[PDB]
């Protein structure tokens, strides 16, 4: 199992322009195009994403092409934000795609906020931290997805997502 493959279970693919679980429209693996109402907003947010005239629609190729951006841009976020990089550093290879998977969710500002996990995670503190994880609007919200990031940090092993 890797980043992709990981993310992929969580987000789900879709071919036509879709509202979040927040109500956002969206596109792909998770793709936001905008947080604004109108559809129409969205589409052209959307052809400016491809370059193209997609009319609400695109291919396979072209969602996984926007899904290696903002992985990429994940990462990198991670590695330019002094909040996260000191714990991604800390971590081993998979507690790594759990913060890789939160920061895409969520963007590096609303993980940079969990101050107290963080502190937690870099400590190795596992159980502990998972305890404090589940305590935010995210594991509300969320919950099946809140909970097998949430394994994952604990056990720092796949099986949350060996029976998905």
Same mark, same amino acid.
């Given at each position: 199992?890797?980043?992709? *493959?990981? +993310? &992929?279970?969580?987000?789900? +693919? &879709?071919?036509?322009?879709?509202?979040? @679980?927040?109500?956002?429209?969206?596109?792909?693996?998770?793709?936001?195009? @905008?947080?604004?109402?109108?559809?129409?907003?969205? %589409?052209?947010? +959307?052809?400016?994403?491809?370059?193209?005239?997609?009319?609400?629609?695109?291919?396979?190729?072209?969602?996984?092409?926007?899904?290696?951006?903002?992985?990429?841009?994940?990462?990198?976020?991670? /590695?330019?934000?002094?909040? /996260? %990089?000191?714990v991604y550093?800390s971590l081993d290879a998979v507690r790594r795609c759990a913060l890789i998977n939160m920061?895409?969710?969520?963007? *590096?500002?609303?993980?940079?906020?969990?101050?107290?996990? +963080? &502190?937690?995670l870099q400590?190795k &503190?596992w159980?502990?931290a998972a305890?404090?994880?589940?305590?935010?609007?995210?594991?509300?919200?969320?919950?099946?997805?809140?909970?097998?990031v949430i394994t994952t940090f604990r056990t720092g092993e796949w099986?949350?997502? %060996?029976?998905?």
């Amino acid at each position: 199992m890797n980043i992709f *493959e990981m +993310l &992929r279970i969580d987000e789900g +693919l &879709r071919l036509k322009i879709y509202k979040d @679980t927040e109500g956002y429209y969206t596109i792909g693996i998770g793709h936001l195009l @905008t947080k604004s109402p109108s559809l129409n907003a969205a %589409k052209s947010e +959307l052809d400016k994403a491809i370059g193209r005239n997609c009319n609400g629609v695109i291919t396979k190729d072209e969602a996984e092409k926007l899904f290696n951006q903002d992985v990429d841009a994940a990462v990198r976020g991670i /590695l330019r934000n002094a909040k /996260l %990089k000191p714990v991604y550093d800390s971590l081993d290879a998979v507690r790594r795609c759990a913060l890789i998977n939160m920061v895409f969710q969520m963007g *590096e500002t609303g993980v940079a906020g969990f101050t107290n996990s +963080l &502190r937690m995670l870099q400590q190795k &503190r596992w159980d502990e931290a998972a305890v404090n994880l589940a305590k935010s609007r995210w594991y509300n919200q969320t919950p099946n997805r809140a909970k097998r990031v949430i394994t994952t940090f604990r056990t720092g092993e796949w099986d949350a997502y %060996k029976n998905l």
